[model samples]
Target: SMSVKKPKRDDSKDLALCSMILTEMETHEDAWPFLLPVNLKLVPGYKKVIKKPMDFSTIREKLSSGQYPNLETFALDVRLVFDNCETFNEDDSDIGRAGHNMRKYFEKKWTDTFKV
Candidate 1:
């Protein structure tokens, strides 16, 4: 005999918290410069377009409508957004400072609570 089915688990609570954090993150336009490009990568000249938008409402809705297997995957996806951030001025730029802030929040605020 063989088995191919995986265990099922409900994590609405965790997902709700993720959704909350996501909402909180998007509350500021200048706080996270990388998120916009991450959200709107498909659009041509998204880099310039991101600067004009107030916030990333579409990305917020899309993530909520989908299902994530677990927290690790979610965290990894967040990190992927920073992969192309080297274009910022330097380690002292707005995006840089904002990135540091986001890192700490992800580590302390998000990771601390999601470590299960």
Candidate 2:
């Protein structure tokens, strides 16, 4: 006789964790530039350079809609937001500095919470 039962992992915990981290990032002081999509009119070359523009609002929507399959995927999108910022702005610029700060904060929070 063999058992047919298979182990299943709960995803709610991961969802909650991602949501918490997102909230923290959104409320951060340096989150201003990343709150929404880049303005195409204001930054003409933004759309041309950053192929996939990721933002906090977009990530929040995805998390709320259960679009992320796993925590790693969610993390990737968050990282992309910062990556795009660095690519479009100068390091000495305000937005660029904010992006660097945000990325550092996120990485620390991620490691502390998930130990990954």
Candidate 3:
């Protein structure tokens, strides 16, 4: 095994991935990462029982801001990605491009969403 230093957590990067999950929750209320059942309730920091379109938007905005960064939540998300390797590409890898775009997308979305 190769010894490796831990990657530094980038505020912008984490915030962006949160936004992607939020968008998925917003766009596809029924679709889940795995066989795992994703109740919106499980996401404790988010507002309860997302019932309207506005709630989706609210959830996306809040998560992308990275205000409620919890270790458990992050671990769960990472595990899901690991388990669902088929969802990702075999050759090039999806993480690289998706990772960078997520934060950039979030920054832009946050700006547009908040600037009234």
Candidate 4:
């Protein structure tokens, strides 16, 4: 007899499994520096973005590993948020030739959140 069929599973379940493994491997040593609080009008909700929901080292692992297995379908959302950010939050001055300083501030922080 020969068997080649592996298995079938959705991304959320897959990430949850990985999260459990990484949780046992995680430690306070890896949770440093990024622990802080700053106002951003409101908490950014990526509930849909993070199908796996990782913290600290687990997140870093995914980023460094460059898998991004469950991170697609979010690129457009990021751009839409950027546009919204520009409309009400952008402060460029000098016809934006001075650059969009305020938008840069938020954009950097937002991007960092995904970087782990």
What TM-score would every model get versus the actual structure?
0.59, 0.89, 0.27, 0.22
Note the residue pairs that clash in candidate 1.
none
Ranking by lDDT: 2, 1, 3, 4
Among the numbered candidates, top TM-score falls to: 2
Better of 2 and 4 by TM-score: 2
Q: 50-101, model 1: which lDDT tens digit per residue?
A: 3433223444555677745776666655554443343333567877667666
| Per-residue C-alpha lDDT of model 4 across residues 13-73, encoded as one tens digit per residue | 4445444433432332322212222124354544433333323343545545655555432
The global C-alpha lDDT for each of the candidates, from Candidate 1 onward, is 0.57, 0.92, 0.42, 0.38
Q: How would you encode candidate 3's per-residue C-alpha lDDT over 1-116 as one tens digit per residue?
A: 27877775545555555556556444442222222333456655223432221223334444556645663454345333333333332423453344333434434654454344
- What is the clash count of model 2? 0
**Model 3: residues with Cα > 4 Å off, grouped in runs:** 1-11, 29-58, 64-66, 69-116
| Per-residue alpha-carbon lDDT of candidate 2 for residues 1-116, written as tens digits (9 for 90 to 100) | 27877765665689899899999999999999999988888988888899999999999999999799999999999999999989989997999999999999999999998874
- For each candidate in turn, give its C-alpha RMSD to the true structure in angstroms: 5.8, 3.3, 13.5, 12.7
